[PDB]
Amino acid sequence: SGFRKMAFPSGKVEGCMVQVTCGTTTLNGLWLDDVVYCPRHVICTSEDMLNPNYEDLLIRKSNHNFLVQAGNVQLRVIGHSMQNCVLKLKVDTANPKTPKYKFVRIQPGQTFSVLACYNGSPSGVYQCAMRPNFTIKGSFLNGSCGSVGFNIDYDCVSFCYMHHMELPTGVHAGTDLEGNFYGPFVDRQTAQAAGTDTTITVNVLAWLYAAVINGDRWFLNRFTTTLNDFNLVAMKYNYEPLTQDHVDILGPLSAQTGIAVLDMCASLKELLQNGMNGRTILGSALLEDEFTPFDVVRQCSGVT
């Protein structure tokens, strides 16, 4: 029992973190096999960030201008290429700690763990979600660029995020491991405002199932609703629309608790309309949406 915002164990990713320096800019890189991935803005000065032409800036860089350091040993750069907003630095040594891996591009609502790093050294690990506006609410300081987001399936690390940018509003923007930004963000120090941060409805429902499983049942009411009726209320509260696919995904949690998904929807509808009235659910005074249905099942079953 108990339910916590749990991140995957980070060891497999810690063994991949390197420091990349280009000139006077230092950030983090991910060393998988004989390639080091990092944000392409490692080639920029603070003045370059205002209006960078990466292709032109990159012409002035050779293999030897990219200093890659693993722990306290220097890696030899034998190649470099820009792919979208990431640089891939070919090194002469395959990472001996390379775990089994995949590069995945996640959808909004999906959760992942972040291993925040500074100077190629891991400082902490936390869980977050890809917001419906394609930002992430992370914890990143200057030097954290190149920190990655990932999920683990037994022994395979699926890398889904690389940190690049912090918007003026304190939210974060980054890419998948192919260098494509999530959302409309661009790696430039220009005014970029985030869209509406809607609540991930399917995740809130999953977390209400986790609460029932852990004994917090006060919010269960005598009502039911329909997808159309629930969504009318969800729209009004800036909640993402719930679809039959989301209902299907909540099937296993519905079976575990014996509470039909549309009954849980009616409970959520009353929670939105009436508020919490000073009460808490799983130690929270707000409805949590950064636990997917898969995270609830994994945490409540013990997948290792």
Next chain:
Amino acid sequence: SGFRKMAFPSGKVEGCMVQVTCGTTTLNGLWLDDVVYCPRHVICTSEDMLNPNYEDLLIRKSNHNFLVQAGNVQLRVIGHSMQNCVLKLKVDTANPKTPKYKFVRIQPGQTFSVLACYNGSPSGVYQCAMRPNFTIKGSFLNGSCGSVGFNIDYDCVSFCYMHHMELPTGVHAGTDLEGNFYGPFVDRQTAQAAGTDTTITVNVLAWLYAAVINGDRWFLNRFTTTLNDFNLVAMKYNYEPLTQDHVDILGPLSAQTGIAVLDMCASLKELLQNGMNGRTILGSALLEDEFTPFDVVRQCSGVT
């Protein structure tokens, strides 16, 4: 910017996790040097837990009855001893992944990361605090016993907790690495109720400083208070008394923000008396108390 419930990177502790089986009971162990630490209740059957005489139960166990498995290889047990509520199993192989370590007994209010494990395999990592009633609000399922709590200082892991028990109320009880329980709990399946879960005042204040640093300033008011006046209100809200030592510990955060500690206390007093009024602080609708002043400085400075 951004502030998350961040755990330490777990790799150094993942390399220590082993599975310990005694008869038909299987739990987790911590392998440091040539010793494996685990809850002494590994020798109990479910019926034994009701009224176990550990010294007597242990007489019926020899070195070969303790099966220690690291990854998928069996370790040879050449000795065993009970120290308080933990068993120390001497094995013939020193853990090659043993990090630099210490065994520390933490005080209530102190935070640590937990690497939840099942069958010696890490499933997740989260941050929690030693509650003032000596329980921890963790996330532990059956088989999670032997999972450890720790803090890291650069490359030294300070192990402070080993998970043993779940109270009927869903809160958790465990020991330091010398086998002494935190609080009055005993490793027996008997009625043990927790005391008052007071709020860690110094941690709430630290988190209010983290909020100011991250831009959430709405709750800053025009008032100040005294330690005596603040504590009168803190007692009424089941908040731990604030002392001059806590004020001293908040000194660095007070300097960073320019907000005197007693002014932050007055802000907290108004928050307790008036509530949040539907507003949030660092994405929370309640006052968070599982971030120490040291965790705030570390997260807001980037200690690796």
